[model samples]
Target chain A: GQSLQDPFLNALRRERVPVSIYLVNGIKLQGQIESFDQFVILLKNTVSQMVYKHAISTVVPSA
Target chain B: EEVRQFRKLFVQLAGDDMEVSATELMNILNKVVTRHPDLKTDGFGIDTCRSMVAVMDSDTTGKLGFEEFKYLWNNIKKWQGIYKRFDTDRSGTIGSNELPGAFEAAGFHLNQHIYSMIIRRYSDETGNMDFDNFISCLVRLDAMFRAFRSLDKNGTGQIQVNIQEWLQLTMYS
Candidate 1:
């Protein structure tokens, strides 16, 4: 019933974990989650970029 | 506060079960779009609602609890943003030539081959995608894309899904 995205994305944010978010276009966004809204994520990679949730593919936590 | 409010609204709408079916979504959407009128819905038909439920129902519950609806609502807004930018003609339909750009805007880099197939499949006879159809297409693509990622342990762009899983992924959503 709960969301898998809520579990994973929230965990990454709570830890301020750096992550590699891949776009389906083969582009990658490296950042920490400053915050996330219903539609977009505020990713702080120096200057924060608002990435739409729709624009992201794979989200891998960086170890 | 917004989360609290959304949870409250969802519970009220979902009744005791706290799981919202496609009917619930359609009814709510119809009321909202009707009141706003700016949403410009032809009709928030059952098909798109089912498509949405299919994508958001991760555990195969076929309905949405709060968390699932949270993600679902998030994506609904996200794809609406895609629709706003990608329906290039402002005529409220994504034309065949405009198809690739729409997917691109949504962060899916698809080539002509598949986009053409999408146009053929999801488009009207005139080959333009209404909002519902466009949303359905994006929903299907995202569902399929995530399905692949779920199976791919390594980020190798290669995934091995057995026949049943493949069929389940394709046949359901």
Candidate 2:
């Protein structure tokens, strides 16, 4: 059953999705959303909050 | 398509530090068997489910270790012939081109089947697969690549790779 198949990653070319989002340790998080525009904003805020919690935990050990 | 499902199951099952039982493995095998009964397999006896359960827990421990179950699963029916083929470099690494051949060899026939399945199932009225359509598709690709890397390097001594021949073999073999 040989047939031509599109690579899934080709979505980036067809959509206005974000790419190469930098995380706390410079790790890259990526995704191609078909509709939502604020995906990156939400993702960024989520990670920022996560990092804030991490930093706080490091500075003050929990009892 | 079921092959892709199995890969997801395997990754989910194996990715964690927990163990599973033969009963659990039978549960998984039952789903795939029910879904894709047409695919040819070596272990299709009436009690195949029991056998699958037995293989997963040889010690009768009531729990299958992830590491042990991984080995048993590979031997059961999933990996089969294809696992050894796409391992092109046999360096236990998988190159992109070697991937299609691997699926074909494994009888998953996914390169084409999965593509068409996604298009048929998730494509828009315009017949275009959207990003959501790609989520499962990409999972299959990622799983295949991971397996390719794990199993292709079984040769012994002095980098004995026949990449050029492998390319030719896959074209017709």
Candidate 3:
């Protein structure tokens, strides 16, 4: 098992989990976590194939 | 001019002290209503002042210094923005259909059941969630969701464990 500091994102990244991030400003994004740090995250959008993650409020993983 | 006016009011309310207690703040707010007879207090202004004190009292000292008051004003401004954004119909209350969007705007993903729970727990007779109730629910739900995410571990949307594991998860994590 990976470290537990960010277990949710770590597990999702390991399993290639597709997820949605809801931002505090009312924006929704679907992507996979490419990388993340203490305050920032990098996400690869499934459709656009581009990176995102700024001001994310919540990250929800699929079943 | 606005800044100067705020300073004047702050000094007047705080008197010769560098900090003001919640009671002093409430008296100041109540005085504003007195100045404008059309503006009624109706117990709401006092509650607002108390909440302002609660937020501004970051150190839990039951008092607000100049810096803390500034911080509180900034947060109150932010909440005003949030309130306006969600009160789309200008109804002073959030409808059931609007609750999800409001929660999402605040950076939360709340399911219908959770929305129902909030409504059931906090809503009034009209089934409309007021700004205070909405904010309260937002804070409560965010904590619960955070705890759930902490325990979900695998992102599998399911927790597979024995009773012992379940107790461990609940008790520790």
Candidate 4:
């Protein structure tokens, strides 16, 4: 039940494209978005990781 | 070689006159995005394409000359380079924490608070700066800093003058 309207993320998810995620703390993570709720996103990297929505900056599909 | 390629792209899109009307540019942009839907951006629309033409039409002749196109292309290339250099992790977006260093590398003296202000003003809800917004912020700040320095004729970074002098400088600027 994510309140944010992330059409960009939806596009990537629909395409099953891997993306690079930029975090507010300057960390970069490359993964596919598995699921997202109002506060967190579940990313499937080499290992499964949960990222806080507020901690993420953006996700680039072709990065 | 890159300049040649840009010229080719311009001519291919604009034709023999080497200039393109806003409609022509918009049509081409729409066609490209339609053909490659994945290339579409969130905020880019026909109006944004029109604004691109307006910005590059330096003569305001309702057409974009090859020279103007070249100028726009080169600026994009330059900013892309600057953006890539700052995006150390190649995340395709600048992190908020790296905003100050990026601006500093671009030769702007943006304090952390000012950088934060710019991010708040320009960054999307995700608090990330894309290449377009990054360049926009840099251009605005660069112009403002230049304006401030132009008023400081004594080489002092800060202005030191009477109210009348300050008024005259302000009006001149």
lDDT of each: 0.75, 0.39, 0.60, 0.63
- Candidate 4: stretches off by over 4 Å: A1-63, B1-6, B21-43, B135-173
Docking class of 4: incorrect
TM-score of chain B of each: 0.86, 0.30, 0.52, 0.58
* Weakest lDDT window of 10 consecutive positions for candidate 3 chain B: B36-45
Q: What residue pairs are clashing in model 4?
A: none
Q: Tens-digit lDDT track for model 2 on B34-143?
A: 55433223323334334344433435554566555556566445443343345454533333445455444543323344445545664446543322122223334444
Tens digits of per-residue lDDT for model 4, B67-167: 97666556555665667777766667787866766776665543345667888897878777865466555544543455455654543224457888555
- Clashing pairs for predicted structure model 1, backbone only: none
* Order by lDDT, highest first: 1, 4, 3, 2
> Against the hidden reference, what TM-scores do the models get?
0.66, 0.24, 0.45, 0.46
The 10 consecutive residues of candidate 4 chain A with the worst lDDT sum are A1-10
Instruction: Name the lDDT value of residue B171 in candidate 1.
Output: 66
lDDT of 2 by residue, A1-63 (tens): 023212322343243234343445644433222222212222221122122222111111011
DockQ of every candidate structure: 0.03, 0.02, 0.05, 0.01
Which lDDT tens digits does candidate 3 get at residues B38-111? 22124334455555565446466767877777655454445546656776777767777677777767765444
Report the C-alpha displacement of residue A42, candidate 4, in angstroms: 52
> Which residue pairs show collisions in model 2?
B20-B64, B90-B152, B90-B153, B91-B153, B92-B152, B92-B153
Q: Looking at model 2, how many pairs of residues clash?
A: 6
**Tens digit of lDDT per residue, candidate 1, span B1-173?**
66898889889989978899999998987776566433345776887788779877898898998898887677767887777777666876778877877687787755456677998898889888877677777777887777766765544345677788777777653
Q: Rank by TM-score, descending?
A: 1, 4, 3, 2
